[PDB]
Design a protein around this motif. Structure first.
Motif, short mmCIF file in Angstrom:
data_model
loop_
_atom_site.label_atom_id
_atom_site.label_comp_id
_atom_site.label_asym_id
_atom_site.label_seq_id
_atom_site.Cartn_x
_atom_site.Cartn_y
_atom_site.Cartn_z
N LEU A 64 0.84 -1.19 0.00
CA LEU A 64 0.00 0.00 0.00
C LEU A 64 0.89 1.25 0.00
O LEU A 64 0.69 2.19 -0.80
N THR A 65 1.89 1.22 0.85
CA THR A 65 2.81 2.30 0.99
C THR A 65 3.60 2.56 -0.30
O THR A 65 3.59 3.66 -0.81
N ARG A 66 4.20 1.53 -0.86
CA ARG A 66 5.06 1.70 -2.04
C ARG A 66 4.28 2.03 -3.31
O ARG A 66 4.87 2.48 -4.29
N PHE A 67 2.97 1.80 -3.32
CA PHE A 67 2.20 2.06 -4.52
C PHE A 67 1.62 3.48 -4.56
O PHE A 67 1.93 4.25 -5.48
N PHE A 68 0.82 3.83 -3.58
CA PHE A 68 0.10 5.10 -3.65
C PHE A 68 0.43 6.07 -2.52
O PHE A 68 0.15 7.27 -2.63
N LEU A 69 1.02 5.58 -1.46
CA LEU A 69 1.18 6.41 -0.29
C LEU A 69 2.55 7.08 -0.26
O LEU A 69 2.64 8.31 -0.24
N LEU A 70 3.59 6.26 -0.27
CA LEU A 70 5.00 6.69 -0.25
C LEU A 70 5.38 7.44 1.01
O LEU A 70 6.43 8.09 1.07
N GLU A 71 4.57 7.30 2.03
CA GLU A 71 4.84 7.95 3.29
C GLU A 71 5.89 7.22 4.07
O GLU A 71 5.87 6.00 4.22
#
Length: 77
Positions: A64-71
């Protein structure tokens, strides 16, 4: 199909929700295998069942993070 995977949404609560396919594997045992996809919808659902990120495993959250969030604020540090 044949009652195995259901589509619910993960409460990202960040303005978008991810449509997650929960594989309910009663054939496996009763373990819910989470899909590897991070397909987000712009739609913030009220009727559909939302599961909060807190329930999701580290790898699923990572996807989830590496796809759309990058937080990366306070994670890994």
């Amino acid at each position: 199909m044949l009652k195995h995977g259901k589509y619910v949404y993960i409460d990202l609560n960040n303005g978008k929700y991810v449509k997650v396919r929960i594989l309910k594997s009663r054939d496996d045992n009763s373990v819910e295998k989470y899909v590897l996809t991070s397909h987000v919808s712009k739609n913030r659902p009220k009727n559909a069942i939302v599961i909060k990120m807190d329930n999701l495993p580290i790898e699923v959250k990572d996807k989830l993070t590496r796809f759309f969030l990058l937080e990366h604020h306070h994670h890994h540090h």
